[PDB]
């Protein structure tokens, strides 16, 4: 159930260029004979994608990242690749996503799985039911914390006569999948051309994903030795992995409503021109498309090299306070203060700021700060605000309408109350 598989045939990873591949309908809207520009996570044109082989005993199935998305394409003839795995650590300590394809059905689970190294689906014969079953317990050992399950029709269906391209995304709470099946006769690498991927599902798993791995099948027909890193043979099935990025595309639509072409606006200045003119044809001439701007490299922070703390302690933790009609004023100057600690302190029942927020207050310099302090009762606290009326705001302490500062108050019944 957890056998290892450590055949040792080392070959370097290959790279290929994705000429025009990975385009998918961003929304479920119909468009015809129109050019539409949209920004979304796409596979840039002529992108540097890795290449992995499974030909004989060379197997390539490492754990790869899932930074923002994946364009997964597979040239197959025997459906050797059965599914994928998604997660952060791929062990029982965290939740993980699983996608596998049984004959004429799909199994999707979000459990805390404990995958063994070099997993895979096993195929054998059962001698009852008279049919070669496909038990999946080689992939994962245990399944804890299951929350989601789902079954549907095959995602993958029938040298390489067919091409299956997939697009995976991990948007806020939805795992979105776009797929396409294209027949081709090319056997070496990706066929240059164009083909759009139609969406398939959008699973609301709502988890965090950073790594992913692929699942393949093995052939042990001609003979079967004991379970070990041997006795397995993999037919010719290779796959390419590409990471998506936020990109602005200009999409074309035909009469039918299919895409059939597109343009990556940041590929080259000619693409910038095409996107600017909202056309795939550019007439002879000069066009203004963008603006060159040199960006800063680093920040420069300069302040006087002085060292002193503002005496907020003798203002807030003062032994006695003043009456509101004779409210005391303290002028704070020539010092450095941390308003973050003041805001952090939960001794205050009222902490309202105007024209500036306290979180963005410990990085702004002022020439002078005035600290007015007094004592009022509960229902009068609301009168200490710009544009308020009452006995206190009219006759005792009035705030301007352009006030820039914070109003802080706290219940002092334990200190400012007498039994009599």
């Amino acid at each position, epitope marked *: *159930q957890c056998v290892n598989l450590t055949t040792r045939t080392q070959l370097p990873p290959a790279y290929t260029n994705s000429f025009t591949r990975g385009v998918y309908y961003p929304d479920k809207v119909f468009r015809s004979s129109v050019l539409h520009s949209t920004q979304d996570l796409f596979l840039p044109f002529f992108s540097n994608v890795t290449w992995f082989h499974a030909i004989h005993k060379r197997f390539d199935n490492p754990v790869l990242p899932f930074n923002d998305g994946v364009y997964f394409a597979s040239t197959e003839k025997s459906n050797i690749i059965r599914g994928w795995i998604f997660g952060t650590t791929l062990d029982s300590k965290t939740q993980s996503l699983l996608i596998v394809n049984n004959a004429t059905n799909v199994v999707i689970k979000v459990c805390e799985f404990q995958f063994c190294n070099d997993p895979f689906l096993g195929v054998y014969y*059962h*001698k*009852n039911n008279k049919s070669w079953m496909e*038990s999946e*317990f080689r992939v994962y050992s245990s399944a804890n914390n299951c929350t989601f399950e789902y079954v549907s029709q095959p995602f993958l269906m029938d040298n390489f006569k067919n091409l299956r391209e997939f697009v995976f995304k991990n948007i806020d709470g939805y795992f979105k999948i776009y797929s396409k099946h294209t027949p081709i006769n090319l056997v070496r690498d990706l066929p240059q051309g164009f083909s759009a991927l139609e969406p398939l599902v959008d699973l609301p798993i709502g988890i965090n994903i950073t790594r992913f791995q692929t699942l393949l099948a093995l052939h042990r027909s001609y003979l079967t*030795p*004991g*379970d070990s890193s041997s006795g397995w043979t993999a037919g010719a099935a290779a796959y390419y992995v590409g990471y998506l990025q936020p990109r602005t595309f200009l999409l074309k639509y035909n009469e039918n409503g299919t895409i059939t072409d597109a343009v990556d606006c940041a590929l080259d200045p000619l693409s910038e021109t095409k996107c600017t003119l909202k056309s795939f044809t550019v007439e002879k001439g000069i066009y203004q498309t963008s603006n060159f701007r040199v960006q800063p490299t680093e920040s420069i922070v300069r302040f006087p090299n002085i060292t002193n703390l503002c005496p907020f302690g003798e203002v807030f933790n003062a032994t006695r306070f003043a009456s509101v009609y004779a409210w005391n004023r303290k002028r704070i100057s020539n010092c450095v203060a941390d308003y973050s600690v003041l805001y952090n302190s939960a001794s205050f029942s009222t902490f309202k700021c105007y024209g500036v927020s306290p979180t963005k207050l410990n990085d702004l310099c002022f020439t002078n700060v005035y600290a007015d302090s007094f004592v009022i009762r509960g229902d009068e606290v609301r009168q200490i605000a710009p544009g308020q009326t009452g006995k206190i705001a009219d006759y005792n302490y009035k705030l301007p309408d352009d006030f820039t500062g914070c109003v802080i108050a706290w219940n002092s019944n334990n200190l400012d109350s007498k039994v009599g």
Partner: antibody
Amino acid sequence: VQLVESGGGVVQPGRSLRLSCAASGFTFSSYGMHWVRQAPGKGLEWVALISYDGGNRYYADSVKGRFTISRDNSKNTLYLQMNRLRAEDTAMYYCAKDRYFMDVWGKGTTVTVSS
Amino acid sequence: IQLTQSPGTLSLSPGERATLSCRASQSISGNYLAWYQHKPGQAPRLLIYGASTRATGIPDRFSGSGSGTDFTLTISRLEPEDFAVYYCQQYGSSYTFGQGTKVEIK
């Protein structure tokens, strides 16, 4: 990962006794299951094995024709039917899961063949 | 396949080195040779498989060697918990066990 045997006790020579092994905590239907016995103060003696799917069975030479091993994958149970018992079959019989070798062993059921 | 273990009884003290042997009447296929530990009143516990592969949780003072008909289990620095009966087993052609070696305190 737990195996609990049952059905032990005293049985008169020549009569029959059926042992059972209840499994939980693992994918029972994907493992071959063995029976092993150990006479008091003596060594381990393999008795029988049944494949994960119940298609293949094998028995020790000393019990061929007399013992039958079976399993029920829907109920996570393995059974050992012991017919025509001899005084020399008295032992503790262990239920054990195949990993091949056996990596999970039950506590064993004591079978005494006596009048 | 008959497995003959030797010696019948081994008497040592903690800290010493123990060597246990297992001989098969026929060559073991695929190095399918396993070692088991048994304490009184306890079920057996897997120590070694594949002639040389340590089982999960087994400390590195246990090591297995040998091939063909001749196999050895070595315990490099005996601990008090290591005093027990040891059985070898072949699983390449049916399933047969040795008669056991008792490792006792001298």
